[PDB]
Amino acid sequence: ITPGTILIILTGRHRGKRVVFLKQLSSGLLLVTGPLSLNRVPLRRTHQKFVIATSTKIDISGVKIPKHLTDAYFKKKKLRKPEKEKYEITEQRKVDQKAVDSQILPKIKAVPQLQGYLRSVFALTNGVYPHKLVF
């Protein structure tokens, strides 16, 4: 798992979606992006034990990720119920999504067919066994 590596998410609502690794946060959780425009996965945290690292990489060496994207930034904010309470995408989050995506996305489109790869979803099919195939 090196920065720019394409990871397959195995759990959560985004399971099976191929995402881009950005960096490891101070708590050991990984920072990934969809990018949101390709598979609808935002700047999100994920656990390394719950992803499959592929051999497909992009060079995000020249990407500047904001320094305020820390574990505390992504930590859930408790919602009180006495009916319900709905999570609302803060405006700062949307601004950060475009800041990071606007740099990573052109690098994705350099690699032919890569964007289509990130739109697709991973699945096991007839006769396909994980221990046999390279990622």
Binding site: I8, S55, Q113, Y117, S120, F122, L133, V134
Partner: protein
């Protein structure tokens, strides 16, 4: 009916064992089950080898039985067995196997797309050819 023979100089492909996937030449025959093989140009020391693990190819080098390694390598270079092997359909099918076995997850996705389009173009043409033959009968 038999076309390939265990004989001095016959080049065999090692299918299983420590040297699987390599080419050796039969230098001598020990008994019904073993041969003295040599692989100077394919990184195999002269040694005993069961016929079970071998597969005779179509090449036959020329050197005396039990000739030492200098002349087995010498004949291998003369016949250029390494390039002759790699140009065979047998060698190409081995290469085609390991290309597919090492395919990356992204590579698998690109093949599916290329295969998906190629399969559609061919099927469309086959329909037109089917229609063509129908008129000749009609």
């Amino acid at each position: 009916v038999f076309r390939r023979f265990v004989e001095v100089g016959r080049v065999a492909y090692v299918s299983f064992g420590p040297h699987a996937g390599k080419l050796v030449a039969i230098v001598d025959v020990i008994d019904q089950n073993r041969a003295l093989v040599d692989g100077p140009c394919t990184r195999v020391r002269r040694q005993a080898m069961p016929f079970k693990c071998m597969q005779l190819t179509d090449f036959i080098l020329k050197f005396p039985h039990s000739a030492r390694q200098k002349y087995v390598r010498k004949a291998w270079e003369k016949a250029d067995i390494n390039t002759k092997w790699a140009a065979t359909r047998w060698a190409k099918k081995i290469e085609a196997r390991e290309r597919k076995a090492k395919m990356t997850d992204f590579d698998r996705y690109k093949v599916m797309k290329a295969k998906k389009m190629r399969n559609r173009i061919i099927k469309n043409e086959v329909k037109k050819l089917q229609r063509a033959a129908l008129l000749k009968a009609s």
